[PDB]
Every structure is written in structure tokens, then in C-alpha cells.
Design a protein around this ligand. Structure first.
Ligand SMILES: Cc1cccc(Nc2cc(S(=O)(=O)O)c(N)c3c2C(=O)c2ccccc2C3=O)c1
Ligand SMILES: Cc1cccc(Nc2cc(S(=O)(=O)O)c(N)c3c2C(=O)c2ccccc2C3=O)c1
Length: 406
């Protein structure tokens, strides 16, 4: 066996994945798998914008684990990559000098481990979307030519669309037969001798944590209470946090209480999605071109954990867009004490499930224009073939050249 390590440096958390695969048949689809993982304590690497040495340091404990997870005599030969995403893209736009110091610091730390360190890079929004789509379809074996002599399956095996909700952006990516009307959104992949025409778009500032900060700025402007927070919940909002984000530009402490108002929560949320103009033949939102969604989809990262809160803790079905919608209202309408009565556990972000759940439902119906028919093909899943679904694997597979173009 051979191994490979990806550090996924997301906006509010760094994650380490160690993959494993047989040396003797490494170019087969679905072959590479997750061997182990590690979660870094504390915030994402961009959080150390003002103390960049701490960013390299935050990675030590997990690096120590990778030394135990990867057998000694293969350290030398095992590639190590760090890919950073929207938090670092944001930090790049507000402070490119701090961004480069952060990446130098992490580079510092990584290059002294005995792995074949190949670089710390910021993924574009296209890469992020595209690599999650690769990951899903690789692990679920959709690049296989199905059938046998001469009863081949016709047409080609359909692929899975991917929706990825991270902390500072969200991505949608799917195979499409519609003409491209924007080349920024056009993707062409060559995988195992096949051509895949793919749409992808990353919405910056539309990740779960940035959505919550924008909701908090608008709740403060319009209401001076938070309709998405539960009645009997209140906190000290630090205006520094709210208004320092590049995502709220265009909006020190204030007490703020929840009111469990689903309709007004839905009003705040729906304001995130500008649908008033479209210079293309069709749009998702904010004037962005998007062809009609089609095929099966997998929705992962924070889509999964929020839906699992609804189905598990709230005990509600989310099989249809409408059950999804009713699940969000019922959650938003709970008081703080009603939430606690369901014995949900020590969830530090319990007050925000309603907002995130409402954001997801708006994003899918008002933003991406799923309806009942097309949402029937969405599954909420975080793992496939015991591997975390995200952009990490497809990234490593592309840098390591494990997928043949032919
Ligand atoms: C790396 C890893 C592996 C297994 C579980 C987790 N926990 C999580 C990992 C992610 S991740 O950023 O998509 O990885 C994530 N987005 C979440 C979690 C969570 O555990 C989680 C728990 C409760 C509410 C929301 C989340 C959540 O959004 C993280
Ligand atoms: C609702 C909401 C809003 C903003 C961020 C989160 N993220 C989280 C919320 C919880 S919670 O304590 O169960 O509330 C939580 N346990 C986690 C997360 C996470 O985001 C997370 C990310 C990566 C690894 C682990 C976690 C995680 O354990 C959840």
C-alpha cells in the first residue's frame, strides 16, 4: 500500500485526511480510500492573520498523528498537500500580505516533517467545487463503464451533482447538457477516456458562518431582536465580529434576544438571495448563470449535519421540499426551553440551527430552483465507501495523477 495526506484548511477549521491504496492497482476508479483523519483544535489558518506563526503550530498534533498513521518506511514517499479554501480566499482579498505570511508559516511547519511535502495552495472556487464532484463520483464508482459484451448500458452512467456548504462559501457542481453562457462556470474533464461537461459555481460569503454573521447584521438593523433565535435565548453580540467580516461590508456590544418567529426568520433569510435580475437566459441568484439542475445530487458538509439535526433531534422527515420547509418552521418556532426539552446534548451552536436550516431550504428552492421532482434526487450524505466526502480526495487524486485521462 501507498499513502497520501491532504490538509483541508477551511475557514473555521483545519482537517487532516490520510488516504491509502494498493501500490499494484492505483489507477482503478474507487480504489483509493480514507485510512485515517484528524481534526485540528481551534480556528482555521486564516484566523491567525495577525499572529501567523500560530498557523503552522496549530498543525503539529495532527502531523504527530500522521507520523503514527503512516508506517515509518513510507513517510519519505508519501505526498503531503495543504489546500486552503474560502477563509484564505477572503483573507487574500482583504490582506494579501497577511495571507502570504500565513502560508509561509504553514509551509515552514510542513517542510520539516519527513513526508514528501508538495505545497500549501489556495484553491479557487472552481477547484473547490470540481474536486468535491470528483470525490463523490470516484468513491461511488460512477466512472465505470457498466454492462458487458454486447449489452452495454446506454447512455453513459449518470454522475452525482455535488453541493458543498462550508463555513465561508458554498459550491454547486453538476454534469449538464446545457450550453455555457458564462465561461467562469464551464468545466471540461477527461476521466478514463470520457468527456464530462460540468457546470460549477462557488458563492463566496454564502457559507454557514458568513450567512449567520450577515443574518445577525440584518436582524440588528431591521428588528433589534433575532427572529431566527429561540424565544428565551439571548446573548452579548460583539459588533467587531459582525462588521469586520468582508461579507457584511454594506451594513462595541449589544444585547440580542431570540423571538422564535419563523416567518420573520424566513424574511431575513430570503433577503440574502437577490433574484431581481438575470442577464443570462436563466440564473440561480445574484445574476449568476445556472442551467436547470438535473440528475442525482449529494449534499455534504454542513448540509448533512443540519439535516441530521432535523431528522434526529427534531424527529422530522425531510423527504420532500415541503417536509423540509415544514421542518424548518417547526424548528424556528421552538422556544429555548422546548429545544432543551428534546435533550439535544451540549451543542454550543443550538440557537443557530433554525437559521442554518432556513438558509438551506431557501438556498435550494429560491437560489438553485430545486422543486419537489428534482429535490427527490438529492441525498444528504457525509461519507461514501467509509471516506469523508469533500474536495480533499479529488484534489489529491489530481495532484498525484491517480486518475488516467485515458
Ligand atoms: C473532519 C470531520 C470528520 C467527521 C466529523 C466532523 N465533524 C464535522 C465536520 C464538518 S466538516 O467541516 O464538513 O468536516 C462539519 N461541517 C460539521 C461537523 C460536525 O460534527 C457538526 C456537528 C453539529 C453541527 C454541525 C456540524 C458540522 O457542520 C469532522
Ligand atoms: C448550527 C451551527 C452553526 C454554526 C456552526 C456550527 N458548527 C458546529 C456546531 C456543533 S454543535 O456543538 O453541535 O452546535 C459542533 N459540535 C460542531 C460544529 C462544526 O462546525 C464542526 C466542524 C468541524 C469539526 C467538528 C465540528 C463540530 O463538532 C453549527
Amino acid at each position: 500500500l501507498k499513502y497520501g495526506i491532504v490538509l483541508d484548511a477551511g475557514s473555521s477549521h483545519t482537517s487532516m485526511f490520510v488516504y491509502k491504496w494498493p501500490a499494484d492497482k492505483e489507477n482503478d476508479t474507487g480504489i483509493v480510500g480514507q485510512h485515517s483523519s484528524c481534526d485540528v483544535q481551534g480556528g482555521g489558518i486564516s484566523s491567525y492573520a495577525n499572529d501567523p506563526s500560530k498557523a503552522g503550530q496549530s498543525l503539529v498534533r495532527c502531523l504527530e498523528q500522521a507520523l503514527r498513521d503512516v508506517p515509518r518506511d513510507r513517510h519519505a514517499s508519501t505526498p503531503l498537500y495543504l489546500g486552503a479554501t474560502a477563509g484564505m480566499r477572503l483573507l487574500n482579498l482583504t490582506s494579501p500580505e497577511a495571507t502570504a505570511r500565513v502560508l509561509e508559516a504553514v509551509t515552514q511547519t510542513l517542510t520539516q516533517y519527513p513526508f514528501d511535502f508538495r505545497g500549501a495552495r489556495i484553491l479557487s472556487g472552481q477547484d473547490e467545487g470540481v474536486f468535491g464532484w470528483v470525490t463523490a463520483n470516484y468513491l461511488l464508482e460512477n466512472f465505470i463503464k457498466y454492462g458487458w459484451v454486447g449489452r452495454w448500458i446506454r447512455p453513459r452512467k449518470g454522475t452525482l451533482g455535488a453541493m458543498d456548504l462550508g463555513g465561508a462559501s458554498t459550491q454547486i457542481t453538476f454534469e449538464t447538457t446545457s450550453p455555457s453562457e458564462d465561461p467562469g462556470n464551464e468545466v471540461h474533464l477527461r476521466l478514463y477516456g470520457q468527456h464530462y461537461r460540468v457546470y460549477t459555481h462557488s458563492f463566496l460569503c454564502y457559507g454557514r458562518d458568513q450567512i449567520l454573521l450577515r443574518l445577525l447584521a440584518s436582524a440588528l438593523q431591521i428588528h433589534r431582536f433575532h427572529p431566527c433565535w429561540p424565544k428565551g435565548y439571548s446573548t452579548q453580540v460583539l459588533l467587531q465580529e459582525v462588521y469586520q467580516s468582508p461579507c457584511t461590508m454594506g451594513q462595541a456590544i449589544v444585547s440580542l434576544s431570540g423571538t422564535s418567529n419563523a416567518t420573520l426568520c424566513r424574511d431575513l433569510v430570503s433577503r440574502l438571495f437577490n433574484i431581481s435580475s438575470c442577464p443570462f437566459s436563466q440564473c440561480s441568484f445574484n445574476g449568476v448563470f445556472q442551467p436547470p439542475v438535473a440528475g442525482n445530487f449529494i449534499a455534504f458538509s454542513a448540509f448533512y449535519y443540519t439535516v441530521d439535526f432535523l431528522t434526529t433531534v427534531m424527529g422530522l422527515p425531510v423527504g420532500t421540499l415541503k417536509q423540509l420547509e415544514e421542518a424548518t418552521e417547526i424548528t424556528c418556532n421552538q422556544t429555548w426551553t422546548e429545544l432543551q426539552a428534546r435533550v439535544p446534548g451540549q451543542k454550543t451552536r443550538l440557537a443557530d440551527y433554525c437559521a442554518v436550516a432556513m438558509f438551506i431550504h431557501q438556498l435550494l428552492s429560491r437560489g438553485y430552483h430545486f422543486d419537489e421532482r428534482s429535490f427527490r434526487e438529492v441525498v444528504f450524505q457525509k461519507k461514501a465507501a467509509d471516506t469523508a466526502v469533500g474536495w480533499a480526495l479529488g484534489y489529491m487524486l489530481n495532484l498525484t495523477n491517480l486518475i488516467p485521462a485515458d
